[PDB]
Design a protein around this motif. Structure first.
Motif, short mmCIF file in Angstrom:
data_model
loop_
_atom_site.label_atom_id
_atom_site.label_comp_id
_atom_site.label_asym_id
_atom_site.label_seq_id
_atom_site.Cartn_x
_atom_site.Cartn_y
_atom_site.Cartn_z
N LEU A 8 23.50 86.41 -14.11
CA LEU A 8 24.86 85.85 -14.17
C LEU A 8 25.02 84.77 -13.09
O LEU A 8 24.67 85.01 -11.94
CB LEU A 8 25.81 87.02 -14.00
N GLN A 9 25.62 83.65 -13.46
CA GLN A 9 26.00 82.62 -12.49
C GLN A 9 27.41 82.14 -12.81
O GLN A 9 28.00 82.52 -13.87
CB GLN A 9 24.96 81.48 -12.48
N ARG A 10 27.90 81.24 -11.97
CA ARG A 10 29.26 80.69 -12.14
C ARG A 10 29.14 79.19 -12.32
O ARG A 10 28.26 78.57 -11.68
CB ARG A 10 30.17 81.06 -10.98
N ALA A 11 30.01 78.65 -13.18
CA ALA A 11 30.12 77.20 -13.42
C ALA A 11 31.12 76.61 -12.43
O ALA A 11 31.88 77.34 -11.78
CB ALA A 11 30.53 76.91 -14.83
N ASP A 12 31.08 75.28 -12.31
CA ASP A 12 32.03 74.54 -11.44
C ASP A 12 33.43 74.64 -12.05
O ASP A 12 34.40 74.61 -11.30
CB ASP A 12 31.53 73.09 -11.25
N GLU A 13 33.55 74.79 -13.36
CA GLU A 13 34.85 74.86 -14.06
C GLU A 13 34.66 75.61 -15.36
O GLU A 13 33.50 75.75 -15.78
CB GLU A 13 35.36 73.44 -14.31
N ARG A 14 35.75 76.04 -16.00
CA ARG A 14 35.72 76.73 -17.31
C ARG A 14 34.98 75.84 -18.32
O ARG A 14 35.19 74.62 -18.33
CB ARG A 14 37.12 77.06 -17.84
N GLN A 15 34.08 76.42 -19.06
CA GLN A 15 33.37 75.71 -20.14
C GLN A 15 34.19 75.98 -21.40
O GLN A 15 35.09 76.85 -21.39
CB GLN A 15 31.92 76.18 -20.20
N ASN A 16 33.92 75.23 -22.44
CA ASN A 16 34.68 75.36 -23.70
C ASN A 16 34.03 76.46 -24.54
O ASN A 16 32.91 76.27 -25.02
CB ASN A 16 34.79 74.02 -24.41
N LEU A 17 34.67 77.61 -24.65
CA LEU A 17 34.17 78.76 -25.43
C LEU A 17 35.30 79.26 -26.32
O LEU A 17 36.47 79.16 -25.97
CB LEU A 17 33.71 79.87 -24.49
N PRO A 18 34.98 79.89 -27.46
CA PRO A 18 36.01 80.52 -28.29
C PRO A 18 36.71 81.58 -27.44
O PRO A 18 36.06 82.20 -26.64
CB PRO A 18 35.24 81.18 -29.43
N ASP A 19 38.02 81.76 -27.59
CA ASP A 19 38.75 82.82 -26.87
C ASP A 19 38.77 84.05 -27.76
O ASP A 19 39.86 84.54 -28.02
CB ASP A 19 40.17 82.43 -26.47
N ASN A 20 37.61 84.52 -28.21
CA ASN A 20 37.54 85.77 -29.01
C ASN A 20 38.10 86.94 -28.22
O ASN A 20 38.24 86.91 -26.99
CB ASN A 20 36.13 86.04 -29.49
N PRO A 21 38.58 87.98 -28.94
CA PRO A 21 39.42 89.00 -28.32
C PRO A 21 38.74 89.73 -27.15
O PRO A 21 39.41 90.17 -26.29
CB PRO A 21 39.68 89.98 -29.49
N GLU A 22 37.42 89.91 -27.20
CA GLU A 22 36.69 90.75 -26.22
C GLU A 22 36.41 89.95 -24.96
O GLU A 22 35.98 90.55 -23.95
CB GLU A 22 35.41 91.35 -26.80
N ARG A 23 36.62 88.64 -24.99
CA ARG A 23 36.28 87.83 -23.79
C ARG A 23 37.33 88.02 -22.69
O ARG A 23 38.53 87.90 -22.99
CB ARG A 23 36.16 86.34 -24.13
N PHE A 24 36.88 88.20 -21.44
CA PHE A 24 37.76 88.16 -20.26
C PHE A 24 38.22 86.72 -20.00
O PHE A 24 37.37 85.87 -19.65
CB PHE A 24 37.07 88.73 -19.03
N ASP A 25 39.52 86.44 -20.18
CA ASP A 25 40.05 85.05 -20.07
C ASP A 25 40.45 84.79 -18.62
O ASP A 25 40.27 83.65 -18.15
CB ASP A 25 41.21 84.81 -21.04
N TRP A 26 40.93 85.80 -17.89
CA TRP A 26 41.42 85.59 -16.51
C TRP A 26 40.34 85.99 -15.49
O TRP A 26 39.87 85.15 -14.74
CB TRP A 26 42.74 86.33 -16.24
N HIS A 27 39.97 87.27 -15.47
CA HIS A 27 39.00 87.81 -14.50
C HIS A 27 37.60 87.24 -14.80
O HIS A 27 37.24 87.06 -16.00
CB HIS A 27 39.02 89.32 -14.50
N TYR A 28 36.86 86.93 -13.75
CA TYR A 28 35.51 86.35 -13.86
C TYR A 28 34.54 87.50 -14.16
O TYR A 28 33.60 87.72 -13.34
CB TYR A 28 35.19 85.60 -12.57
N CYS A 29 34.77 88.21 -15.28
CA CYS A 29 34.06 89.45 -15.69
C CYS A 29 33.17 89.18 -16.92
O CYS A 29 33.47 88.29 -17.76
CB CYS A 29 35.07 90.58 -15.97
N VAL A 30 32.14 90.00 -17.04
CA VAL A 30 31.31 90.11 -18.27
C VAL A 30 30.94 91.59 -18.39
O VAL A 30 30.81 92.26 -17.34
CB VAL A 30 30.06 89.21 -18.15
N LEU A 31 30.72 92.05 -19.61
CA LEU A 31 30.33 93.46 -19.90
C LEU A 31 28.87 93.49 -20.33
O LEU A 31 28.34 92.45 -20.75
CB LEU A 31 31.19 94.04 -21.03
#
Length: 191
Positions: free
Chosen positions: A40-63
């Protein structure tokens, strides 16, 4: 040497080694999941991804890709010399879009590091940890039936933190969180 060996034998007596891979479909749009799904790494800014329901939109989380509804499971994470990270488990039903505080009350059991030296358990209130040997590799230990989430220094077998025993509701997922833009990735150790 003996403490490493006792740590290895305890894991075998009691915990099933989980083979954890990151689900990019859950990852906050600022996160990068490696092509092998272990890092896992972090980008300089939000990349363009679908906001599908399971995605964490606020917290910098992944499952992880698999949940736990029963039994004793562990996995180890190479945090290396990262200055910042949090790892643990969360319920399937956690809030993914609006902010919630990452606490057991909100379905998160995580510990980690801030500002290179501040180890904390994200209990509510947060637990200040005192860690004599900062870990490069952390073991995450789950016992679903007894409501147990605990963390170890996987290189020397030293204990880091155990949450109060609780009652889980529904499936638990491995969860990983990085806030900073820094050279060392978070990497899952395969089973």
């Amino acid at each position: 040497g003996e403490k490493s060996q006792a740590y290895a034998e305890w894991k075998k007596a009691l915990f099933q080694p989980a083979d954890v891979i990151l689900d990019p479909n859950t990852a906050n749009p600022i996160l990068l999941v490696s092509d092998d799904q272990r890092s896992l790494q972090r980008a300089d800014e939000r990349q363009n991804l679908p906001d599908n329901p399971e995605r964490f939109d606020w917290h910098y989380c992944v499952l992880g890709c698999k949940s736990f509804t029963s039994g004793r499971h562990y996995w180890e994470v190479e945090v290396g010399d990262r200055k910042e990270w949090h790892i643990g488990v969360c319920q399937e039903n956690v809030e993914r879009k609006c902010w919630v505080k990452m606490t057991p009350e909100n379905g998160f059991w995580t510990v980690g590091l801030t500002d290179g030296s501040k180890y904390r358990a994200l209990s509510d209130p947060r637990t200040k940890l005192t860690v004599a040997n900062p870990p490069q590799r952390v073991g995450v230990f789950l016992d679903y039936e007894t409501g147990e989430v605990s963390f170890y220094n996987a290189m020397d077998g030293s204990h880091i933190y155990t949450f109060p025993h609780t009652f889980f509701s529904g499936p638990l997922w491995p969860v990983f969180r990085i806030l900073t833009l820094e050279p060392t990735a978070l990497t899952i150790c395969p089973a």
